[PDB]
Design a protein around this nucleic acid. Structure first.
Ligand SMILES: [Mg+2]
Ligand SMILES: [Mg+2]
Ligand SMILES: [Mg+2]
Ligand SMILES: [Mg+2]
Ligand SMILES: [Mg+2]
Ligand SMILES: [Mg+2]
Ligand SMILES: [Mg+2]
Ligand SMILES: [Mg+2]
Ligand SMILES: [Mg+2]
Ligand SMILES: [Mg+2]
Ligand SMILES: [Mg+2]
Ligand SMILES: [Mg+2]
Lengths: 100, 66, 142, 144, 75, 185, 57, 62, 141
RNA sequence: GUUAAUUCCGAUAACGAACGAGACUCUGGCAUGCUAACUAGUUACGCGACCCCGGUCGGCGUAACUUCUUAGAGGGACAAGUGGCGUUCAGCCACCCGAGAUUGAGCAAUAACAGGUCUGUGAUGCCCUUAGAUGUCCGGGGCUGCACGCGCGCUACACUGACUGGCUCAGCGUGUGCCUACCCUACGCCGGCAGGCGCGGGUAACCCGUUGAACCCCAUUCGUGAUGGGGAUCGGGGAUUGCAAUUAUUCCCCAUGAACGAGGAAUUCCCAGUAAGUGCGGGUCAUAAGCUUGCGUUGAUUAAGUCCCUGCCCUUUGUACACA
């Protein structure tokens, strides 16, 4: 009943589009839904020397990967959850479904 | 150093010469005017254009400009 | 009856002070302890100064409880120094005559502007090839 | 009480080592080799001696007790770890050495290393660092 | 070259002069006491607190690093 | 509320500035009085906002140098407070007034530069900064490797500079610079 | 190499583009290393526009 | 010789090998008709008082 | 009317140490005088009755933030460990001294080993703590 | 002339342009206006504990909200306004109102070097070895060896300090691995100690963790002594990891107690939350930072200028150089 779907994505625009589409689908079906919360962004930062060898001035790179996680709470039968989640999904967003 | 570049100055000149009627001495009014008229993707550049537009409008209303 | 609850946040380098104002006597305390004993106690006047300038008459009608989190000791005490004044100004502007709000703001600003507006200064990022933001390691000629 | 009393011993020779008595007791004892600040404080705490007194303020009836405790630490409720020669090679008993047997036991261990021709003994014989330090840029002062 | 031979404990003459001239100073601090009496700083602090216990010296402030004492008023 | 004062003892008023060339560069009277010499700062943003900073705050900031004292403001504020207590006990008059007298006396009026040397009169701001730095250097030099605490090594330096009896290090360096400037003109 | 570079350049231009650049570096035209560059049109080397306006291989 | 106070009325510009000084037009506060030039060390403004020990020697102008 | 937070802690800890001194039912360990409070310390504590003060401070910390175990106390009482040539780093205090203090305060009815771990201060200890604070407030004013 | 800029104005046989810079992206600022939140909270309500109606709780549950927290769309600052300098153009200074009136970084170019990488490679031409191997595997040594010189760094030379107790505040992150055999830790016992023994939490805004860090603040001891500064050298003992420590992996205790009294010639980096002080994450990891990459705390003096020195760019000039 109290279903909870977790969406992790690398692109902010795609993730916001997916969450907006899901909540609009919930609005169309007239289901009680919690607001889209935003977990703090995870920035995997790696710093490496530009030069393959050790010569030259000490110059370092800054390669960072940003991951955003948003979760939505809904009150609906699991069949409704599967129906809603099976459609309108961007390939770049990882989806997790939790019953509890 | 706060110097307007060629893009800002040239765009401001042509905008004023094309919409001299719709522009005035109020920075905020023509800021929205130039937003509606010309497609400037960056708002900072938009403010730069609007600022130079107002300065040129003051110059025009006071006297000639080359 | 009426709930004159006023929330206000004052910011420092990193510390933040959320002061809550309601109806009550002239009791002022932060983190559940009074202002007179706040280590480092050397800068006690930096916390009593908002009370001193405006007088206990203004603070008699309002009780303030504040929560402090983040930053260092000097950051927190300056955060609460700003937040106490901001909370009183917000309370006066929202529930009593604004002439009192205008006069206290003028007095606070003419004394020190930091009472109201937060300083936007932050720590600068460090860069490679040096020990600090601007500092660079020792150059080695020959 | 601040006035200096009579019979003030300015210098006390304890374990054939001179000690200046115008300083604090816990650090005047440190003048003896083989006992430091940590050892002196423990000894002066086992004895009923107030710390604030000086080495010339107290009497000689208790200094004999102190030195006996120092030379016999295990008999006055001091554990083995607080000694400098725990589990000695020769006699195999935990004991404290103070400024007389300290060097004798030191050369005894070195002489043992010399006899067995161990790596540590060879380093001591050659005057080179024994704990594997880099001598390329260090130790130049001692070796010419 | 130059070394100071400070007195660890009071001599009779030093104790007498401490009881006589020290209370009449405009400022009373252990640093100045040691400087003008050729005694240890610790001895000066012990003497000043003992004289404070006697009640002949007033204080203005107390601090871990330096404690400042003031003389009695003439009134 | 009126009557803005120092830590707990001394009021901003009853201060006399004999030199009228430092009226706008000495900030002690009725507009820059603070209970503590500690402020958020922002006086190093523009050029001539340094003068508006209270002179006690400038003294407190300039006191902490020589590495080990760097970034220690809560220590020098106590040091300045103790120095104010000592001078008040000694002279029996206004500690801020004696600080002003010390600064206006220690401040050099002439100096030498390269344009051999040529004599040039210093700016009022430059004079104040040089005096507020020389007297700290002299007090620090006196306190170093000595039993006497710096909490009074700054204070006795203050009264010596205020009296101008040629005993303060700042006064001695001031006269040396004036002598050099006088010769090279 | 010259025929190949001009041929691919013309193919890219006739396909429809705003700017093209190709660099061929190696031991062509002699054992000594040389780099040949063929450029035309507007080219952008700076900013994030290079991430979504020019593609490099 | 008396020490005199003068009021700055105009700034000429930087001077010195490294540009470490600023030659400044200054005027005395008792007879404002008489005005001279002098090199001043340190940051300066327009409309401030300078203490001159010697009011006769003149700094070189550029 | 007066609690611990209504009075200064600097003399409150000394007053509670005096309260423990006049109580004398803590059963202090045998090695109190011959122990170093942490690996980052050099000598034994200057105060010979430091155990009463440490117990007083531990009770104060437990009252302010309950549920702190031995590891939490070591983190609280840790400090710089000057390794000599190498620059200092933070190091926790000795586990045994904090654990013995907790057991000593457990023997008396002042703290309790509550659920979900940690140490919880009992109401009787709370009554003793703030009535000591009340005495401090009365003595000061 | 002006600008950080061949950035612009302005004279002008030039006019229009393009790359670069600029622009742009990320980052910090502030919005009681919008969206939202039991993996974050706030305000009130009810119990529980405590003190003389009131006060405290990171003690327990629930009626509202997102101010505090997290993250999304937008807004917002532009030399916008005033007074001055400036052909009255570009631009510069001061100021009021104002979160800011110069936040930092990334990409960064027609071109050159015979600068480094053939030891990053299943990227590679040629040469060489190719079975008594320059391929591979195993045992051990070495990469640390010390009469000397030089460079990058740590510790300090002490009273603004050291030592001993008390009080008190953060954000950067990471954390159970494909082969892979190795994670981050709350809590209770043993012990001074590193560390050992047990059940638990965590694939993470959920657990460590409200990251009770240091500096600093408060109170005693030291008293100008190479002294309780300083921790080099060195002995003995106790533990962890690893198949294995000897040339002592690392950690802990006792003890021994060197130079160094602020450092010559010369020389390094820097201008605002900057340097410096201080501590904390990641890389290396079975064991590990005295390096580096970042973060947090305290936090200043000088100065809004120049070609004097050093370089480096433009112009003029000279050329018998042009693989320069
Ligand atoms: Mg060693
Ligand atoms: Mg090639
Ligand atoms: Mg080639
Ligand atoms: Mg471009
Ligand atoms: Mg530890
Ligand atoms: Mg660019
Ligand atoms: Mg192949
Ligand atoms: Mg092989
Ligand atoms: Mg030494
Ligand atoms: Mg050794
Ligand atoms: Mg150099
Ligand atoms: Mg010629």
């Amino acid at each position: 009943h109290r279903i909870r779907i977790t969406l992790t994505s690398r692109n902010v625009k795609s993730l916001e589009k997916v969450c907006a589409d899901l909540i609009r689908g919930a609005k169309e079906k007239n289901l009680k839904v919690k607001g889209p919360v935003r977990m703090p962004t995870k920035t995997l930062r790696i710093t490496t020397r530009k030069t393959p060898c050790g010569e030259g001035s000490k110059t370092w790179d800054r390669f960072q990967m940003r991951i955003h996680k948003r979760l939505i709470d809904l009150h609906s039968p699991s069949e409704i959850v599967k129906q809603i989640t099976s459609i309108s999904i961007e390939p770049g967003v990882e989806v997790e479904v939790t019953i509890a | 150093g706060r110097v307007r570049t060629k893009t800002v100055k040239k765009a401001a000149r042509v905008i004023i010469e094309k919409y001299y009627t719709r522009l005035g001495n109020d920075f905020h009014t023509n800021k929205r005017v130039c937003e509606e008229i010309a497609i400037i993707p960056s708002k900072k550049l938009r403010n730069k254009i609007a600022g130079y537009v107002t300065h040129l409008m003051k110059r025009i209303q006071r006297g000639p400009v080359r | 009856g009426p709930l004159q609850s006023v929330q206000v946040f004052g910011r420092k380098k990193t510390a933040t002070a959320v002061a809550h104002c309601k109806r009550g006597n002239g009791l002022i305390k932060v983190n559940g302890r009074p202002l007179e004993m706040i280590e480092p106690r050397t800068l006690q006047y930096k916390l009593l100064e908002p009370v001193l300038l405006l007088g206990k008459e203004r603070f008699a009608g309002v009780d303030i409880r504040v929560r402090v989190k983040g930053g260092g000791h000097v950051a927190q005490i300056y955060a609460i120094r700003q937040s106490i004044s901001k909370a009183l100004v917000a309370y006066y502007q929202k529930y009593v005559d604004e002439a009192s709000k205008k006069e206290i703001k003028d007095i606070l600003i003419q004394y020190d502007r930091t009472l109201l507006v937060a300083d936007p200064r932050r720590c600068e990022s460090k860069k490679f090839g040096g020990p600090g933001a601007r500092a660079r390691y020792q150059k080695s000629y020959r | 009480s601040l006035v200096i009393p009579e019979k003030f011993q300015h210098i006390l020779r304890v374990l054939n080592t001179n000690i200046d008595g115008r300083r604090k007791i816990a650090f005047a004892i440190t003048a003896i080799k083989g006992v430091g600040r940590r050892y002196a404080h423990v000894v002066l705490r086992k004895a009923d001696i107030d710390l604030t007194k000086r080495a010339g303020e107290l009497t000689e009836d208790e200094v004999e007790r102190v030195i006996t405790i120092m030379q016999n630490p295990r008999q006055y409720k001091i554990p083995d770890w607080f000694l400098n020669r725990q589990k000695d090679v020769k006699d195999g008993k935990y004991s404290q050495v103070l400024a007389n047997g300290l060097d004798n036991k030191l050369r005894e261990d070195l002489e043992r290393l010399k006899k067995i021709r161990a790596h540590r003994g060879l380093r001591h014989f050659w005057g080179l660092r024994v704990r594997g330090q880099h001598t390329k840029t260090t130790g130049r002062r001692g070796r010419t | 070259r130059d070394k100071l031979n400070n007195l660890v404990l009071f001599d009779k003459a030093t104790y007498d002069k401490l009881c006589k001239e020290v209370p009449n100073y405009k400022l009373i601090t252990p640093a100045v006491v040691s400087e003008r009496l050729k005694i240890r700083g610790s001895l000066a602090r012990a003497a000043l607190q003992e004289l404070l216990s006697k009640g002949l010296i007033k204080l203005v402030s107390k601090h871990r690093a330096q404690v400042i004492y003031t003389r009695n008023t003439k009134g | 509320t009126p009557d803005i004062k120092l830590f707990g003892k001394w009021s901003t008023d009853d201060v006399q500035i004999n030199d009228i060339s430092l009226q706008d560069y000495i900030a002690v009277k009725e507009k820059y009085a603070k209970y503590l010499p500690h402020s958020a700062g922002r006086y190093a943003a523009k050029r001539f906002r340094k003068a508006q900073c209270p002179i006690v705050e400038r003294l407190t900031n300039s006191m902490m140098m020589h590495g080990r004292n760097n970034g220690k403001k809560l220590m020098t504020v106590r040091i300045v407070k103790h120095a104010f207590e000592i001078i008040h006990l000694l002279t029996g008059e206004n500690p801020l007034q004696v600080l002003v007298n010390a600064i206006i006396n220690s401040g050099p009026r002439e100096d030498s530069t390269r344009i051999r040397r040529q004599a040039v009169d210093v700016s009022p701001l430059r004079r104040v900064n040089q005096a507020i730095w020389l007297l700290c250097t002299g007090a620090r030099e006196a306190a170093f490797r000595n039993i006497k605490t710096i909490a009074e090594c700054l204070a006795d330096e203050l009264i010596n500079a205020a009296k101008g009896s040629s005993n303060s290090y700042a006064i001695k360096k001031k006269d040396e610079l004036e002598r050099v400037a006088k010769s090279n003109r | 190499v010259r025929r190949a570079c001009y041929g691919v350049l013309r193919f890219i231009m006739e396909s429809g583009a705003k700017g093209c650049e190709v660099v061929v570096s190696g031991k062509l035209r002699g054992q000594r290393a040389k780099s040949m560059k063929f450029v035309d049109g507007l080219m952008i080397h700076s900013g994030d526009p290079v991430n979504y306006y020019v593609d490099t291989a | 010789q008396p020490i005199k106070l003068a009021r700055v009325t105009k700034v000429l510009g930087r001077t010195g090998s490294q540009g470490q000084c600023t030659q400044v037009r200054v005027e005395f506060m008792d007879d404002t008709s008489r005005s001279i030039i002098r090199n001043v060390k340190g940051p300066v403004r327009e409309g401030d008082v300078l203490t001159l020990l010697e009011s006769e020697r003149e700094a070189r102008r550029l | 009317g007066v609690t611990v937070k209504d009075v200064n802690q600097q003399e409150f800890v000394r007053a509670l140490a005096a309260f423990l001194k006049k109580s004398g039912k803590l059963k202090v360990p045998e090695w109190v005088d011959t122990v170093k409070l942490a690996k980052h310390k050099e000598l034994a504590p200057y105060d010979e009755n430091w155990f009463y003060t440490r117990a007083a401070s531990t009770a104060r910390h437990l009252y302010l933030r309950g549920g702190a175990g031995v590891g939490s106390m070591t983190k609280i009482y840790g400090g710089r460990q000057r390794n000599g040539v190498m620059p200092s780093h933070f190091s926790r205090g000795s586990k045994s001294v904090a654990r013995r203090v907790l057991q000593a305060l457990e023997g008396l009815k002042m703290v309790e080993k509550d659920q979900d771990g940690g140490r919880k201060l009992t109401p009787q200890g709370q009554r003793d703590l703030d009535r000591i604070a009340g005495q401090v407030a009365a003595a000061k004013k």
